[PDB]
């Protein structure tokens, strides 16, 4: 943690193989104006001023705590943040637009970051089949900007952070059936997660730079979890109407009927 001018934050990393959250702290310097925007959020350039422990900021009460205490690792010595967010790193911070900040609760920040980590595992499962192009999803973290005056409201300011992508950012499909590029690997990764999960999930909203992807969305047949972008059977079926499995689908031996 550098003594340089910045702001403090509580840092949250999710580890799927142990299925627990890792609680940390960091200092960061955010630019005043955003450099890009989506439908719901704005993105800011940020520089890391160091990652440390959370010893100075106790959780206090177990009751009403989210995420719950049983989902929190008691040891935080190992994590991705210490290398990928080390002092000097340039990264990206994302805030919700006001409005609709009204549709962003504390649970949805953690649910969104857990969803990206889940998609990150599917990328590794995809890469084990040795496709022509390997895909990879970026890390993602929840950060509580504790130095910023709470929404009033009375809730602290939350955000998500992730590594910086350098290059042309392109969206390949949406979360409701659009096919926006001629590339085969993004659609085939979608034709892949739906079949290999036995139709329990599909990963769409495949976007990013080259084969580094971020901000995916998951549909599940019951429509539960994975945020408000989970359109259930409708989202799954909408992908099937516009999908043509391709040479990558064929190479992965996916079923041409869905
Ligand atoms: N990791 C990233 N690195 C650089 N630019 C990004 C990144 N994520 C999102 N963006 C930009 O921010 C915009 C908003 O993305 P979204 O997160 O979908 O609202 C995108 O259209 C990109 O131009
Ligand atoms: Zn396919």
Residue numbers in the entry: 552 to 809
Q: Which lines from the publication concern this structure?
A:
Dictyostelium myosin-II heavy chain kinase A (MHCK-A) phosphorylates the α-helical coiled-coil tail of myosin-II, causing contractile bipolar filaments of myosin-II to disassemble into inactive monomers. MHCK-A is a member of the atypical α-kinase family of serine/threonine protein kinases. The α-kinase domain is bi-lobed, with the active site located in a large cleft at the junction of the two lobes. The α-kinase N-lobe is similar to the N-lobe of other protein kinases but the C-lobe has a distinctive structure and requires a tightly bound zinc atom for stability.
To gain further insight into the function of Asp663, an A-CAT D663A mutant was crystallized and its structure was solved to a resolution of 2.5 Å. Although A-CAT-D663A was crystallized in the presence of MgATP, AMP was present in the catalytic cleft. Asp766 was not phosphorylated in the A-CAT-D663A structure. A surface representation of A-CAT-D663A shows that the left-hand side of the catalytic cleft is closed whereas the right-hand side is open. The D663A mutation eliminates a hydrogen bond interaction between Asp663 and the Tyr647 residue located at the end of the β7 strand. The hydrogen bond with Asp663 attracts Tyr647 towards the C-lobe, so that it can interact with Leu659 in the αC helix, which in turn interacts with Leu779 in the N/D-loop. The absence of the hydrogen bond in A-CAT-D663A causes Tyr647 to move upwards by 1.8 Å. The upwards movement is transmitted to the adjacent β6 strand and P-loop and disrupts the hydrophobic interaction with Leu659, causing the side chains of Leu659 and Leu759 to moves outwards by 3.0 Å. A-CAT-D663A retains the ability to hydrolyze ATP and ADP, showing that Asp663 is not essential for catalytic activity. The D663A and D663S mutants retained between 25 and 50% of wild-type ATPase activity, but exhibited extremely low kinase activity (~1% of wild-type).
